[PDB]
Write a protein that binds this ligand. Structure first.
Ligand SMILES: O=c1cc(-c2ccccc2)oc2c1ccc1ccccc12
Length: 112
């Protein structure tokens, strides 16, 4: 139930596992989709704090949030993020996701 993806430092998508493409339901549309565009409104500030924590410390722990698929439906995801460096400089973002059920996302939502 877990899949990986790679993003630029603005979290625009670069590549994604074929497992994740089947869940999200979007390859041609993957490069046109910048960051924070398909994240739920109630999660944008919390999700942006993980982006700040990623750039500040180099890693972001598992956080639960809602992402919109192609069908318009919201998907509960929990993602851990790590940085890839090019000579000590941050280069890309590597994310590890896990597809969650609605009850699983609600339980992790109540932990923050
Ligand atoms: O909306 C972006 C896309 C993605 C994303 C996730 C799964 C599939 C495709 C894009 O997630 C994030 C985004 C931006 C900031 C994030 C911070 C922490 C964790 C995830 C973030």
């Amino acid at each position: 139930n877990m899949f990986k993806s790679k993003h630029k430092l603005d979290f625009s998508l670069v590549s994604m596992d074929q497992r994740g493409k089947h869940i999200l339901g979007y390859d041609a549309e993957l490069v046109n989709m910048g960051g924070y565009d398909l994240v739920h409104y109630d999660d944008l500030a919390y999700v942006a704090s993980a982006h700040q924590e990623l750039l500040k410390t180099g890693a972001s722990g598992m956080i639960a949030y809602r992402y919109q698929k192609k069908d318009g439906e919201w998907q509960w995801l929990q993602t851990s993020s790590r940085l890839v460096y090019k000579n000590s400089k941050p280069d890309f973002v590597i994310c590890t996701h896990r597809q969650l059920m609605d009850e699983e996302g609600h339980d992790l939502l109540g932990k923050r």
